[model samples]
Target: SIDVKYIGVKSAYVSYDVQKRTIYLNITNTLNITNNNYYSVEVENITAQVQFSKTVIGKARLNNITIIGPLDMKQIDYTVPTVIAEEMSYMYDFCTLISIKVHNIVLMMQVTVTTTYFGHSEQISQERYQYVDCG
Candidate 1:
């Protein structure tokens, strides 16, 4: 569905710890924070719904997505500054269901630079750069 859109305002930095029910999110890498891009991984329980995609011609498009619960979840969008960090790894299946009702966590990365035919060359493209949040 090549019509996705997400302009700005989506900051997040969550934290939840209910006697072992972990949920820690730091999300804050809209772009270069000092080199290192982005990288996050932490999945627990079962109720996930985080999805994102890219690679137009080769097929892989999906743009923005969100869903989170059962603990921690972070999704941000700062005028599309940047974000990728290897798709922030995380999944579930640990067994922690308090009644499941919501869980669509998201964290797609792609700041700017659009070229469906900017200068030709398989159509110039340079997006997907944002990830650097540690310690």
Candidate 2:
């Protein structure tokens, strides 16, 4: 499994499914920012075709889109502007653990990874995730 810390003003994460051609965005509340004076929450990474409510906590799942990965928000092609409050930068450092969950089975896999951005390229710091299946 992976545990990633949210360290942006707010971050929007997009995970793409190759089989179904669907894209998912994980919107995280980080900076706890507020808007007033007729200002609005603005995001520039991906274009959302639809706008959803923000009552959800931690992470807000976005509408499903049909596409193939690796993909980002630019692929969705939204009609209006969608703003993400706290968006993480690849230029910064962040770590996350990723694992698969299903039914009642628990597979043991853990990895910590850090990302560093260099212009158009990126550097990753990660270790092998190894574990015994303990159900």
Candidate 3:
């Protein structure tokens, strides 16, 4: 078992593009290895979701992550590219403004980690929501 911490969203905004159908969200997450069975852990297959009012607006996947030593903590970073649904496109301006200045959104992340010397696998997840200033 491990302790998953929601480090919060680092930045959330819409990038300038002609298509303009995407939102870029930078998120941070931490994992605390509390088990004594293994000296380290390998976490990978990370996936992220951008949720607004209980609806997922976008999704992103990340690379692998490795943490060293038992009781050690690892910080994982992700730049999530969430595509805005066509139905909600009309609200794009409002959503973009909120995220760029004072983000009021939720980031849900999931990952699989291998602990124990013999590679015991486990699935971990965490969610963080709040206003984050992107400067």
Candidate 4:
């Protein structure tokens, strides 16, 4: 079995979209992964979806190749966006309440990982939460 240790957020901040004329969160997360299996494990991709009140506001992905040799450990990090918010017509108000109307908010995260080992591919999924102080 592959061991994955969620190291939590390394950094987080708000970003602007000049063209879209909006704002969002750029939350970065750090993960420590240990290859317990005998095969050299390769991470093909990772997806982190930003959510509020069960609504998906935004998402981010790290598709870069990451390799963990057999019995080795590796650090993985990636950032995700949380606006102009998804389905803005419906979620704009929700995003505002989550990002602007509040000082500290609990952001829910959905983590999914795609890995390949010795020509065999597999997927692992998990959950995470971060108390965001995006000041």
Candidate 5:
């Protein structure tokens, strides 16, 4: 098991609603995957989504292979850059925007960080509700 540290969103933007479908939020952040093990860790994929009020929202992902060498530290940071934007009700939009930026409220998000090494890719979707900026 490695440490998938959360670095709160660097920046975010809310797009206006066009025909009730054009409205969306752009959530961007960089993630740090630290492997204390003295062995190389190869990363496979990253999944991110943002939502509030127990409803569904948009999600984005980056799929490629990146390697974190042994004794990995903060220097091995990956910009898992981007958002989980989709059409939602007006209430969620207002709520999400407020909660995402306003740190007092702890908004939860589900993320999956898949890893693969030596040809065997693990199929474990670590479902942890890591807050965007809640430390």
Candidate 6:
């Protein structure tokens, strides 16, 4: 079993692009592998979903990954952009009304990890949500 405690967000910030009707978030996290079985885990991909309660505001896909090592703390940084305008006026308008600042909105991140051992591969996914802040 993978220990959820090993994954944590170190810092995060949010910003808005009015012209693009998009929300951009930059996140830095600490990835620690506490066991040998996870020493070789691979980051397959990541995605971010901005939302308000149950309504999804926007989504973005991250396009990078690498292998990880065990018993060390590593910094994982990425910037995600969610285009709110894609779903149309009401949604963007709702977001505009609810969000006092870029970080006041609800944000969720989905991370996909892959592991290969003995010529076999497995995929694992996890989702995290939090109220971010604009820094």
Per-residue accuracy of model 2 over 59-89 as CA lDDT, tens digit each: 6575654334474433334365569999874
TM-scores of all candidate predictions against the true structure: 0.13, 0.13, 0.15, 0.16, 0.13, 0.15
Task: Go through the candidates in order and give the clash count of each.
Answer: 11, 16, 0, 0, 3, 0
The deviation in Å at residue 49 for candidate 5 is 43
**Stretches of model 6 off by over 4 angstroms after superposition:** 1-5, 9-118, 132-135
Task: Report the Cα lDDT for residue 22, model 5.
Answer: 66
For candidate 1, lDDT tens digit of each residue in 32-121?
345454545343455544335333475455543544436643445335345666666455644443334444445444433342322213
Badly placed stretches (over 4 Å) of model 5 are 10-37, 40-119, 124-135
Q: Quantify all predictions' global Cα lDDT against the true fold.
A: 0.45, 0.46, 0.49, 0.49, 0.47, 0.48
Candidate 4 on 1-135: residue-level lDDT in tens? 665656654533444335666665696857676656467657556656543335335684444335554664344444565666456345544323254444443443344343332344356656445454434
| Span of ten consecutive residues with least summed lDDT in model 1 | 115-124
- Candidate 6's residue-wise lDDT over 69-122, tens digit each? 465534564577766855644444432325443533333344435343233344
Candidate 6 clash pair list: none
- Give the CA lDDT, 0 to 100, for residue 86 in model 6: 59
lDDT of 6: 0.48
Go through the candidates in order and give the C-alpha RMSD of each one to the true structure: 27.6, 30.1, 27.0, 27.0, 28.3, 27.0
How many angstroms is residue 110 displaced in model 1 relative to the true structure, after the best TM-score fit? Answer: 2.1
